[PDB]
Amino acid sequence: AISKNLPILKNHFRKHWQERVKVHFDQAGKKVSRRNARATRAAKIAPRPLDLLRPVVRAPTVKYNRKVRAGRGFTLAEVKAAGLTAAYARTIGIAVDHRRQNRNQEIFDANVQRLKEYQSKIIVFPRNGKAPEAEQVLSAAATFPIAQP
Amino acid sequence: AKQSLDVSSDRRKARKAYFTAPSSQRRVLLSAPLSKELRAQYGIKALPIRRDDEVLVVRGSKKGQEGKISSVYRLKFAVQVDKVTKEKVNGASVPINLHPSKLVITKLHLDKDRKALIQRKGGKLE
Amino acid sequence: AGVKAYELRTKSKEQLASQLVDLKKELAELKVQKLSRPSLPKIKTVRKSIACVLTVINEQQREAVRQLYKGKKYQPKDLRAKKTRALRRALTKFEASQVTEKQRKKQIAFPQRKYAIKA
Amino acid sequence: EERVGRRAANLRVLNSYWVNQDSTYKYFEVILVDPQHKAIRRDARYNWICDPVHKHREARGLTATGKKSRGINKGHKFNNTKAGRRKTWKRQNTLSLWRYRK
Amino acid sequence: SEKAGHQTSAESWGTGRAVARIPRVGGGGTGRSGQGAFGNMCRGGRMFAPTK
Amino acid sequence: GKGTPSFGKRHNKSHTLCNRCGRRSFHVQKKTCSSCGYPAAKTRSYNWGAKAKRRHTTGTGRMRYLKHVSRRFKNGFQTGSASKASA
Amino acid sequence: AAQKSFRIKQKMAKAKKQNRPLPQWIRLRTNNTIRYNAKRRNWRRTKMNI
RNA sequence: UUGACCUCAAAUCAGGUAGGAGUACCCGCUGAACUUAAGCAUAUCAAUAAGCGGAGGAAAAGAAACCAACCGGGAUUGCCU
RNA sequence: AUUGGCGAGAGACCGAUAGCGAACAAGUACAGUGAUGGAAAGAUGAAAAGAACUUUGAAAAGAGAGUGAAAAAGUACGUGA
RNA sequence: UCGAAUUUGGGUAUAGGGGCGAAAGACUAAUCGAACCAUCUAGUAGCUGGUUCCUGCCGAAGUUUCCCUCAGGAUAGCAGA
RNA sequence: GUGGAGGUCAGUGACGAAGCCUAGACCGUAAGGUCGGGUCGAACGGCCUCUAGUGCAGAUCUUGGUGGUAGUAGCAAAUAUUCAAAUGAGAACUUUGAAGACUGAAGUGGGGAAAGGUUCCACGUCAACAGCAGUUGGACGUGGGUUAGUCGAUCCUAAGAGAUGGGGAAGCUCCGUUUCAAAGGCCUGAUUUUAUGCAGGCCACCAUCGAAAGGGAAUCCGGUUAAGAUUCCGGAACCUGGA
RNA sequence: UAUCUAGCGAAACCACAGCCAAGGGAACGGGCUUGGCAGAAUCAGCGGGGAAAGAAGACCCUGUUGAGCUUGACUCUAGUU
RNA sequence: AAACUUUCAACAACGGAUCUCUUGGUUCUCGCAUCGAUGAAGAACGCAGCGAAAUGCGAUACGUAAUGUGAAUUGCAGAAUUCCGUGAAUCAUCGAAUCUUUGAACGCACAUUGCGCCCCUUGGUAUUCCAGGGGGCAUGCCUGUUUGAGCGUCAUUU
Structure with missing residues (x-):
């Protein structure tokens, strides 16, 4: 039980773990199915970029505050400063977040210039009349990469 | 190769589908090639076999023997032909079972569904 | 015959x-x-x-x-369509397509827009 | 709600609330709906409960008493029971092994 | 299969019956009755170290 | 006298035919079926009886109605008839 | 029992009609695996058990 | 006397609906013991097996009475950590 | 998420004491009062062409003949320790 | 022993830590100081038995100390690589 | 060395692969490999490497099979058989006759209950079974047989079981059977289907199951079949319900 | 009955089998050693031997194996106050 | 010397291993959601010219209708210009039906093919009785209808 100069190995297998082994043989199968789900999603909602536009937010805690990342959605103040209704921003592919608040100017400035670039780069198809021949850019995240400040 | 994923290259599933095929599936499994003159006359290569077709046996021990079909025996995947039999020891004449892929059809039994099958496969009906 | x-x-x-x-x-x-x-x-x-x-x-x-x-x-139960018990208890197409006037106003005023990035 | 939902198996238990108590009994007025009544199948504010997943919701813990008693709340106080204590127990006791082992 | 060799309710007869201590199928009158099971050495039992 | 002389008095019937599962399992004095739980509403079945579930599950019998639901779902539970008369 | 129920008599009538050997033309059919009646029951060998 | 209202009935009233099966997965309740601790009682097994109730193609959860102490993030779920 | 159902495709899997209990009229025969327990059993040949007929024997069957590439394939049937 | 604390049929009731016992721990479906069936369960065992091809080379120990330890372990020693 | 995999020998093979047998050879210290002969009939090897459910003499091992014992023990309770004829290939056993016997009316008889299920009976038949035998059979194969107003069940209640109402229980379900229940089932008259009313009015009743031996409407005689009889037929009755 | 014959026809057991004396040896050998001896195949008895067979000794001991029962052993607990 | 005992070979037996196959299993992946009071799963019993199972089915009973293919099924018999056809088949498909007795089982009951009741209709002189046929009769709960109950309570009416 305790033999030789060996480290104490805390192996947690005294339950009935063999009833609950999940082995991911479907890792290749799910990747094909996820790409097929993305392909049939883009076929459903063509020509929108299959994901909403996410803000450049600052990561919490002192370990990760040196790096910015993607937020859930823009704030109400950010969308209003860009000059569009938050309900209208939801319809044109901008994710908007109602609980995140604005207390940092350069994060606010980076997010509103992201919104200015998004409104300049997309067009809104008219409700009536012939929609223009517009190609679909499949990745809005690859269209707007997040740069460090 | 095998590109469409709906069809299988499993030997077991292919053999199961063959032996447990119903009579409608067995009709097209029991297809026979036409002769050289029937290929020149109708423009098709092979055709599912009927009960009134003049056939010629081109393989086996019955090679070089013509005949007319007596009964398409779809249960044994065989066809039984007239005047090509086996003389049993008690004087009887039992029909020799033949797979239609070893036979060559010399004359057709052209009904209107048979004729409509000819232009369905792309024939000219000469 | x-x-x-x-x-x-x-x-x-x-x-x-x-x-x-x-x-x-x-x-x-x-x-x-x-x-x-x-x-x-x-x-x-x-x-x-x-x-x-x-x-x-x-x-x-x-x-x-x-x-x-x-x-x-009120067609008789043998003379009406026997699909599936769960489908017969389920909401019909009309009642599932029902929304209130509040959500109908939101859908009309702000429909799901069509948009595209020109790269 | 469980005993009422067994009595009215044709109705969906919406909610319940305390009305009275004594030494021996606690009294609860339990709100139920008719999911096949046309006033509930129409008027789409309330037609979510005739959806076939909401039947016998009081026997699964979907009502507010069940949501309390299952410990389903957001917080660090509810780490065992976030999406169900058995869902977390499966998630934390499965040995998830991959194709290329980590 | 993880139930292979274990869709069986064999119980050992113990000693005192002049047969080996292996689990044997109870009941009676079927040919399978009294036959050893639940072991790698037994016909119809599970393999040693079932492949996972 | 607990064996062969006592097997001659073994001539009553503790169990008779059941009207639900058809086994000789309906206890006469208890008025209940030991195998299917007749006349209670639930068919008696247990997870410790994995083989006992296997003996009486769906698919052991005819499936007089359930064998057509797979075909009826596959065509979409439609009504009416195929309309074209003949080729 | 000489005074039985109709259910018992109905079970006997099923078992009486079942108690017969294989028809001889079953052996003559193609790809036949059946050689004999394995469910054949005699009263001196196996009881019907009601 | 006659009309109500409130409550409680009844009807083979009119129209409906629930049961039961399956149960691999899911939502709860209930709930052990073998085991291990070289004994064994807390502990472990295990908030598991059995039992019971209830659904669906998923279920559950789900738009914070949250996490955090950061230049703060931002429904729920799942995976790597 | 999914060891059930329906359908499909695969395998450095097993190959008839193995693989599901069950390749076969398998949850079947059979056993137990009962809950329950629960087998064994695949392959002639390409095709029955499954041995017409003669003889001995009551018959089974044998010996000839004959079919078949082979009867050192005769349904007690691949090979046959 | 044989006219009743008799015998016996059928119906009925009592079900497992329970029943029933003119009391033997007797009987409870050939099972009884805790029935049978299935599951947890492939429970555990310092204890017994077995542990499947060849050749080459090297090659022991039954002793120190500790342990509810004395049929076993750990540690040091001997031994191989 | 075995099962399988990736290569390769443009490897071997129906002019015979794998298998199996071989007091027949060769090689290897050996594990084993190779060849020849016989059988066989459809796939299989060498080398490099990978992979494993990989090598058996033992586990009172598992499954299946076969021995010695061994043509052995045994086929020794129920007093007991013998002769002829017939059938038949064949008679200790079948059938009939003649004897002799036995059960000796709390019988080895005639009926039935539980149980069994077609065993009853006929015809054909003896591959297996009958502790020997078999022409026989409760066996095998094909058929035929069970007739009820009166016999029973059905109806009633016993000891009891068991719903409903209701009360517990997380529940499966448990109690309770008249309980803290609004528990209906018949009387009527407008005109012989007649009011779905005051009316020639009431027990305050409590579902239901429970006995083929208890309670109970009413059938006897004679004949009849291969096998049915209180059932069929002939005769003679009786009860219930109705008009 | 056993015995013999006709028919039918097992099992227990079985490393291999089967003559002893003495010696030694795990201290009571059928086999080893040294002697005696030893001639096919048998039948019916018989109970000296095969430490004959029938059961992983039931007596005893060990197990950090249980179980039944008991109590002013420990710790709890239904009930009741 | 033979018999017997032992060993080996050949051939024949017993037995079914090895080898070869494989309408089966196991595992993995993918796709879908689809039982039931409009009566489910399950059971019992019947149905084929000759079937005991398996499979299929339900007195319309190895099925009927509709559609498609187009000439079989087959072990034998029988039918088969039903065959240039609204047309065979143990065919496929399946959208209309039937669906015995049951079973959550639902009039009550059930170790009984028991005992009932109501409506319409036919027959026996028939509103009552006996039959035949058809259709019903469970419990809980919801909404509405109708009939009610309660000095619970209000107004009005001598």
Whole structure:
């Protein structure tokens, strides 16, 4: 039980773990199915970029505050400063977040210039009349990469 | 190769589908090639076999023997032909079972569904 | 061969029921000839010929019930569509497409827009 | 709600609330709906409960008493029971092994 | 299969019956009755170290 | 006298036919079926009886109605008839 | 039992009609695996058990 | 006397609906013991097996009475950590 | 998420004491009062062409003949320790 | 022993830590100081038995100390690589 | 060395692969490999490497099979058989007759209950079974047989079981059977289907199951079949319900 | 009955089998050693031997194996106050 | 010397291993959601010319209708210009039906093919009785209808 100069190995297998082994043989199968789900999603909602536009937010805690990342959605103040209704921003592919608040100017400035670039780069198809021949850019995240400040 | 994923290259599933095929599936499994003159006359290569077709046996021990079909025996995947039999020891004449892929059809039994099958496969009906 | 349903459907109720009574009579006479003969496969033809007739009798009577109850609420449960119990308890297409006036105002004023990035 | 939902198996238990108590009994007025009544199947504010997943919701813990008693709340106080204590127990006791082992 | 060799309710007879201590199928009158099971050495039992 | 002389008095019937599962399992004095739980509403079945579930599950019998639901779902539970008369 | 129920008599009538050997033309059919009646029951060998 | 209202009935009233099966997965309740601790009682097994109730193609959860202490993030779920 | 159902495709899997209990009229025969327990049993040949007929024997069957490439394939049937 | 604390049929009731016992721990379906069936369960065992091809080379220990330890372990020693 | 995999020998093979047998050879210290002969009939090897459910003499091992014992023990309770004829290939056993016997009316008889299920009876038949035998059979194969107003069940209640109402229980379900229940089932008259009313009015009743031996409407005689009889037929009755 | 014959026809057991004396040896050998001896195949008995067979000794001991029962052993607990 | 005992070979037996196959299993992946009071799963019993199972089915009973293919099924018999056809088949498909007795089982009951009741209709002189046929009769709960109950309570009416 305790033999030789060996480290104490805390192996947690005294339950009935063999009833609950999940082995991911479907890792290749799910990747094909996820790409097929993305392909049939883009076929459903063509020509929108299959994901909403996410803000450049600052990561919490002192370990990760040196790096910015993607937020859930823009704030109400950010969308209003860009000059569009938050309900209208939801319809044109901008994710908007109602609980995140604005207390940092350069994060606010980076997010509103992201919104200015998004409104300049997309067009809104008219409700009536012939929609223009517009190609679909499949990745809005690859269209707007997040740069460090 | 095998590109469409709906069809299988499993030997077991292919053999199961063959032996447990119903009579409608067995009709097209029991297809026979036409002769050289029937290929020149109708423009098709092979055709599912009927009960009134003049056939010629081109393989086996019955090679070089013509005949007319007596009964398409779809249960044994065989066809039984007239005047090509086996003389049993008690004087009887039992029909020799033949797979239609070893036979060559010399004359057709052209009904209107048979004729409509000819232009369905792309024939000219000469 | 026996009787066929396409020319059985050209008849009214009277001669069809008379032929049903008749076809039962050759069925019974074939059953008493079954006891003397060693084989009689003609009883299968009459048995299916009977079965053709009262299928047609049931089909004309049920279609008369459809024409009687046409275009009115509360069709009978045997005379309405038996899809699946869970589908019959489920909401219909109209009631599932119901929304309130508040969500209808939101959908009309702000519909899901069509947009594209020009790269 | 469980005993009422067994009595009215044709109705969906919406909610319940305390009305009275004594030494021996606690009294609860339990709100139920008719999911096959046309006033509930129409008027789409309330037609979510005739959806076939909401039947016998009081026997699964979907009502507010069940949501309390299952410990389903957001917080660090509810780490065992976030999406169900058995869902977390499966998630934390499965040995998830991959094709290329980590 | 993880139930292979274990869709069986064999119980050992113990000693005192002049047969080996292996689990044997109870009941009676079927040919399978009294037959050893639940072991790698037994016909119809599970393999040693079932492949996972 | 607990064996062969006592097997001659073994001539009553503790169990008779059940009207639900058809086994000789309906206890006469208890008025209940030991195998299917007749006349209670639930068919008696247990997860410790994995083989007992296997003997009486769906698919052991005819499936007079359930064998057509797979075909009826595959075509979409439609009504009516195929309309074209003949080729 | 000489005074039985109709259910018992109905079970006996099923078992009486079942108690017969294989028809000889079953052996003559193609790809036949059946050699004999394995469910054949005699009263001196196996009881029906009601 | 006659009309109500409130409550409680009844009807083979009109229209509906629930049961039961399956149960691999899911939502709860209930709930052990073998085992291990070289004994064994807390502990472990295990908030598991059995039992019971209830659904669906998923279920559950789900738009914070949250996490955090950061230049703060931002429904729920799942995976790597 | 999914060891059930339906359908499909695969395998450095097993190959008839193995693989599901069950390749076969398998939850079947059979056993137990009962809950329950629960087998064994695949392959002639390409095709029955499954041995017409003669003889001995009551018959089974044998010996000839004959079919078949082979009867050192005769349904007690691949090979046959 | 044989006219009743008799015998016996059928119906009925009592079910497992329970029943029933003119009391033997007797009987409870050939099972009884805790029935049978299935599951947890492939429970655990310092204890017994077995542990499947060849050749080459090297090659022991039954002793220190500790342990509810004395049929076993750990540690040091001997031994191989 | 075995099962399988990736290569390769443009490897071997119906002119015979794998298998199996071989007091027949060769090689290897050996594990084993190779060849020849016989059988066989459809796939299989060498080398490099990978992979494993990989090598058996033992586990009172598992499954299947076969021995010695061994043509052995045994086929020794129920007093007991013998002769002829017939059938038949064949008679200790079948059938009939003649004897002799036995059970000796709390019988080895005639009926039935529980139980069994077609064993009853006929015809054909003896591959297996009958502790020997078999022409026989409760066996095998094909058929035929069970007739009820009166016999029973059905109806009633016993000891009891068991729903409903209701009360517990997380529940499966448990109690309770008249309980803290609004528990109906018949009387009527407008005109012999007649009011779905005051009316020639009431027990305050409590579902239901429970006995083929208890309670109980009413059938006896004679004949009849290969096998049915209080059932069929002939005769003679009786009860219930109705008009 | 056993015995013999006709028919039918097992099992227990079985490393291999089967003559002893003495010696030694795990201290009571059928086999080893040294002697005696030893001639096919048998039948019926018989109970000296095969430490004959029938059961992983039931007596005893060990187990950090249980179980039944008991109590002013420990710790709890239904009930009741 | 033979018999017997032992060993080996050949051939024949017993037995079914090895080898070869494989309409089966196991595992993995993918796709879908689809039982039931409009009566489910399950059971019992019947149905084929000759079937005991398996499979299929339900007195329309190895099925009927509709559609498609187009000439079989087959072990034998029988039918088969039903065949240039609204047309065979143990065919496929399946959208209309039937669907015995049951079973959550639902009139009550059930170790009984028991005992009932209501409506319409036919027959026996028939509103009552006996039959035949058809259709019903469970419990809980919701909404509405109708009939009610309660000095619970209000107004009005001598």
